[PDB]
PDB file of C-alpha atoms in Angstrom:
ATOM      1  CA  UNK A   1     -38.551-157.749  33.524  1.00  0.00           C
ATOM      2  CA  UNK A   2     -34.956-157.070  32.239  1.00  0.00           C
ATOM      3  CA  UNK A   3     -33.832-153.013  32.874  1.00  0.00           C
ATOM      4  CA  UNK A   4     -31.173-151.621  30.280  1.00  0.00           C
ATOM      5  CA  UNK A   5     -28.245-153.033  31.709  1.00  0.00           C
ATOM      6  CA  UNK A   6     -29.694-156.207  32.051  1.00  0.00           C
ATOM      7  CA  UNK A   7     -30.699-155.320  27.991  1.00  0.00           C
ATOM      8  CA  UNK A   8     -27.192-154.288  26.847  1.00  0.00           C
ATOM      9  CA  UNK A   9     -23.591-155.830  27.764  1.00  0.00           C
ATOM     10  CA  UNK A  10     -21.398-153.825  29.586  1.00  0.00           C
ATOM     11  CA  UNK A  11     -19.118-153.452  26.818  1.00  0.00           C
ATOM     12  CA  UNK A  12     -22.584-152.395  24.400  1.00  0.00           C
ATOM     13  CA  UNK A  13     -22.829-149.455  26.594  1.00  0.00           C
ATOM     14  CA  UNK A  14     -19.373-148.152  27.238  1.00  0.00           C
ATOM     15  CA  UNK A  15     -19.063-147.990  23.269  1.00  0.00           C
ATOM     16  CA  UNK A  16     -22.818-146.434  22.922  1.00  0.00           C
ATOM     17  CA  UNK A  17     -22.018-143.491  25.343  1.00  0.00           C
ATOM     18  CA  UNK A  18     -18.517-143.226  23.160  1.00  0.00           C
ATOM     19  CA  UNK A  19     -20.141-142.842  20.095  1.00  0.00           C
ATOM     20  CA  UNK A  20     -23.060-140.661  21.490  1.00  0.00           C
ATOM     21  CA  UNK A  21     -20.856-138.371  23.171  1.00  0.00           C
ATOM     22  CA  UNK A  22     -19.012-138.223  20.138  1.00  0.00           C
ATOM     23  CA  UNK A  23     -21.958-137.411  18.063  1.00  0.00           C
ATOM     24  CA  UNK A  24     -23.660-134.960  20.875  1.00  0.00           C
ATOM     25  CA  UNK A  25     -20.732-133.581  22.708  1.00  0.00           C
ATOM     26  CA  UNK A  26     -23.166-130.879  24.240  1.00  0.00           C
ATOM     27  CA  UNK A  27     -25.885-133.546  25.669  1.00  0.00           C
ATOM     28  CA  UNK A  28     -25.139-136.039  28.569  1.00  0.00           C
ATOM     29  CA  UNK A  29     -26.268-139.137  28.384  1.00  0.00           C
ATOM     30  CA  UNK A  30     -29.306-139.927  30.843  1.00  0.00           C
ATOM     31  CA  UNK A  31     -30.812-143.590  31.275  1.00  0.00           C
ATOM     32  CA  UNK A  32     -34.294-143.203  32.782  1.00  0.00           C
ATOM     33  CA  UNK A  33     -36.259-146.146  34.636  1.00  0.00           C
ATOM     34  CA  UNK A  34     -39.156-146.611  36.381  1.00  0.00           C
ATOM     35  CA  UNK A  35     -38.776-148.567  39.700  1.00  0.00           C
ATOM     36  CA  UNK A  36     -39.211-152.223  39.531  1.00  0.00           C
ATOM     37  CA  UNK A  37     -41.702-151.688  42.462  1.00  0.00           C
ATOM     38  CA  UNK A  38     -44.030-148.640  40.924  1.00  0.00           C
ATOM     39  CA  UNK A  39     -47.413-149.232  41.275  1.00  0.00           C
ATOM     40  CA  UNK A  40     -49.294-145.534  40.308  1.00  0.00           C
ATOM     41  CA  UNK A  41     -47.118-143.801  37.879  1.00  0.00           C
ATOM     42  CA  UNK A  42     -47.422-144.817  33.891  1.00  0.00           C
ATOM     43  CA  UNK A  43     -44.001-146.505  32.384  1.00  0.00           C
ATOM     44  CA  UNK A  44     -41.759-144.140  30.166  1.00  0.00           C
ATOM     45  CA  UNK A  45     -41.980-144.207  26.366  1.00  0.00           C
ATOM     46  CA  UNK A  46     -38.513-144.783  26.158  1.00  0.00           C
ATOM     47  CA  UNK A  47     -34.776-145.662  28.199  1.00  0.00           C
ATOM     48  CA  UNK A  48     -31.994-143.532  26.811  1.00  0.00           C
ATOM     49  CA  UNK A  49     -32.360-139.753  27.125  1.00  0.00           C
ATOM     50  CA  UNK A  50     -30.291-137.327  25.972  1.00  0.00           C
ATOM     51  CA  UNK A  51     -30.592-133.649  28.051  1.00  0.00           C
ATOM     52  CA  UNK A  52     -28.624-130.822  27.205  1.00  0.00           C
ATOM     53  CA  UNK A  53     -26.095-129.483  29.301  1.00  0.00           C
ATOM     54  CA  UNK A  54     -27.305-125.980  30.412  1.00  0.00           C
ATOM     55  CA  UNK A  55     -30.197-127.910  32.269  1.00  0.00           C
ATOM     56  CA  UNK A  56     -30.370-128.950  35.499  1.00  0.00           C
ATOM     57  CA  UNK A  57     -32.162-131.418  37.696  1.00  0.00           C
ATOM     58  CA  UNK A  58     -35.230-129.422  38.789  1.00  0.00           C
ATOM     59  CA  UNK A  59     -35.796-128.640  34.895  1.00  0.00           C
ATOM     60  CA  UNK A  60     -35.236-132.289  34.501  1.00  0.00           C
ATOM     61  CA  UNK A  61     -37.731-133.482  36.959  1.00  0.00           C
ATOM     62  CA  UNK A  62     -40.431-130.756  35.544  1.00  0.00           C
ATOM     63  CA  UNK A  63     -39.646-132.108  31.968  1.00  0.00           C
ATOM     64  CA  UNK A  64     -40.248-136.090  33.041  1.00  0.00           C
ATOM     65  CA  UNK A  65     -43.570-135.087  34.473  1.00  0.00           C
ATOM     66  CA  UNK A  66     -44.979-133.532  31.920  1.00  0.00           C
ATOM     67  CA  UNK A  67     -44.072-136.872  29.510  1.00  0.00           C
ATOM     68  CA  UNK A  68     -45.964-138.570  32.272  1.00  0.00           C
ATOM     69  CA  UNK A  69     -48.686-136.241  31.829  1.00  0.00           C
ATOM     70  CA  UNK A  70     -49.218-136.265  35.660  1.00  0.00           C
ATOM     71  CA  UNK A  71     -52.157-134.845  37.418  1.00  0.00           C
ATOM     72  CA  UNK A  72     -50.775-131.884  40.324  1.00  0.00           C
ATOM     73  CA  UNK A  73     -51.863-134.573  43.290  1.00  0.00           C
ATOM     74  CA  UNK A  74     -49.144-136.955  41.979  1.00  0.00           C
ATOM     75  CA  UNK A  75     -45.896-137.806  43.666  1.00  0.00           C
ATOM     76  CA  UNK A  76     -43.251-137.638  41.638  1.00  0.00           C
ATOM     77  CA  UNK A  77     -39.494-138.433  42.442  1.00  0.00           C
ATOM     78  CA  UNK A  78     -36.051-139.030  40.575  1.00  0.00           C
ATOM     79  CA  UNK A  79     -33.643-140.800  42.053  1.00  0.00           C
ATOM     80  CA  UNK A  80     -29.909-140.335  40.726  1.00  0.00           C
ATOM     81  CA  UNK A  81     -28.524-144.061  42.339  1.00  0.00           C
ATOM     82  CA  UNK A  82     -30.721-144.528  45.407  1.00  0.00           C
ATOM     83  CA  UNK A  83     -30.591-140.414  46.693  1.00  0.00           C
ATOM     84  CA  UNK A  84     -33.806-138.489  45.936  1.00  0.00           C
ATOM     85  CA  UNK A  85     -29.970-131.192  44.834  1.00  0.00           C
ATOM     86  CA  UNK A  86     -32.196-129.615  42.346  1.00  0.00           C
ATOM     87  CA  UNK A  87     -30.501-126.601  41.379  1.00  0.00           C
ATOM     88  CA  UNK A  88     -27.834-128.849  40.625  1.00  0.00           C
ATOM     89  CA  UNK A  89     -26.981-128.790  36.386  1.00  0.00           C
ATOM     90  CA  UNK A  90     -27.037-131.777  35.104  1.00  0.00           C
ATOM     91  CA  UNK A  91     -23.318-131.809  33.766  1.00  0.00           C
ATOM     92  CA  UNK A  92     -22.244-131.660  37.233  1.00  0.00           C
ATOM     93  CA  UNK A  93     -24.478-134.732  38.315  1.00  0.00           C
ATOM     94  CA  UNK A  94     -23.210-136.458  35.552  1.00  0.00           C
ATOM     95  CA  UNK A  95     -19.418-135.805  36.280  1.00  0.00           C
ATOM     96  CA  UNK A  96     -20.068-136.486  40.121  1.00  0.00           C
ATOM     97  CA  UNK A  97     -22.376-139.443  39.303  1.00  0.00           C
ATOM     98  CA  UNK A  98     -21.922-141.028  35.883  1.00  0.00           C
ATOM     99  CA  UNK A  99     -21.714-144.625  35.757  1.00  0.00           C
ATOM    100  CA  UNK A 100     -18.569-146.495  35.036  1.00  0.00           C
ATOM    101  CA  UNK A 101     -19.964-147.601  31.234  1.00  0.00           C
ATOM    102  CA  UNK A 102     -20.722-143.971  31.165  1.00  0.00           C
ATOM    103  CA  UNK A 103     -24.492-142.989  31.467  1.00  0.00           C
ATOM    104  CA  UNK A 104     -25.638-141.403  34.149  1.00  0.00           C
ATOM    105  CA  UNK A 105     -28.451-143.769  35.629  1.00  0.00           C
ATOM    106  CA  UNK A 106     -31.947-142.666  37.111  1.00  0.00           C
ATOM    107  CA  UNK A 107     -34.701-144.335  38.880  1.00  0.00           C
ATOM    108  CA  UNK A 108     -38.362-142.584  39.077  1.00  0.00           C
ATOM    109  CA  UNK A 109     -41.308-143.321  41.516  1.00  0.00           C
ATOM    110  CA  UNK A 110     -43.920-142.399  43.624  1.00  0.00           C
ATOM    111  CA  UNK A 111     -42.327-143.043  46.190  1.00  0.00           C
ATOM    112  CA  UNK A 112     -38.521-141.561  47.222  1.00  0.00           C
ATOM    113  CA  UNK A 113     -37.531-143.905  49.423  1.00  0.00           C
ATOM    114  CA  UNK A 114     -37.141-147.801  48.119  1.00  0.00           C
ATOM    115  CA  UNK A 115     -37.531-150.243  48.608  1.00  0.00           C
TER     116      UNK A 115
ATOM    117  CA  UNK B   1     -37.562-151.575  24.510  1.00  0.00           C
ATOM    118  CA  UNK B   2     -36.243-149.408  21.733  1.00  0.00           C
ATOM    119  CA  UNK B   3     -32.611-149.048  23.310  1.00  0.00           C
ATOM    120  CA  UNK B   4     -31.606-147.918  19.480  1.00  0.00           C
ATOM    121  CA  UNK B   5     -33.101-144.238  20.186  1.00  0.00           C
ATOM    122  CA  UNK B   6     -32.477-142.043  22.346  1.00  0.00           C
ATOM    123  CA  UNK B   7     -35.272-138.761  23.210  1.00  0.00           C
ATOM    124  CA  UNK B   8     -33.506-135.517  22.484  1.00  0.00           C
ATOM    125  CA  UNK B   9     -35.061-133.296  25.353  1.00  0.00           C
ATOM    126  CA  UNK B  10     -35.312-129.799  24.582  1.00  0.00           C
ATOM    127  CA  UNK B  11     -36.025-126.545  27.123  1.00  0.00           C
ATOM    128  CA  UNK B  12     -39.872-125.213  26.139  1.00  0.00           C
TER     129      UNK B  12
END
């Protein structure tokens, strides 16, 4: 049950987010998982997003449920390492939060505390 | 997984 960076070296990723940001120097580079431990929400149809950087994380979170295709009575929560603001725009999570190889990591589930 | 792609997510 290998996630991404179990996937990819650490060295893989520092040079994909180089080349990426490169490439798309007005999108920040998301990596979206599902918790190891989900048991009611559907898996993702892929890992590496890329969101634009006039967005922020309550767009985000609308735009993750609607690729789940979730009914209303659904919990839904994204986790930016382990804490569950949503007005916040998603350049400024990514400067505060951004990994060391350079993606900014995310965690959804059901549930927003785990676990 | 297909870590070769990344989604491009848009605003609707």
């Amino acid at each position: 049950e290998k996630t991404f960076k179990q996937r990819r070296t650490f060295e893989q990723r520092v040079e994909d987010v180089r080349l990426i940001r490169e490439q798309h120097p007005t999108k920040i580079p998301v990596i979206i998982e599902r918790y190891k431990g989900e048991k009611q929400l559907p898996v993702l149809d892929k890992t590496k997003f890329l969101v634009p950087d006039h967005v922020n994380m309550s767009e985000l979170i609308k735009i993750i449920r609607r690729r789940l295709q979730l009914n209303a009575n659904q919990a839904f929560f994204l986790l930016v390492n382990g804490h569950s603001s949503v007005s916040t725009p998603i350049s400024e999570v990514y400067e505060s939060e951004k990994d060391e190889d350079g993606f900014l990591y995310m965690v959804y589930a059901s549930q927003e505390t785990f676990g | 997984a297909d870590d070769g792609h990344f989604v491009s997510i848009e605003l609707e």
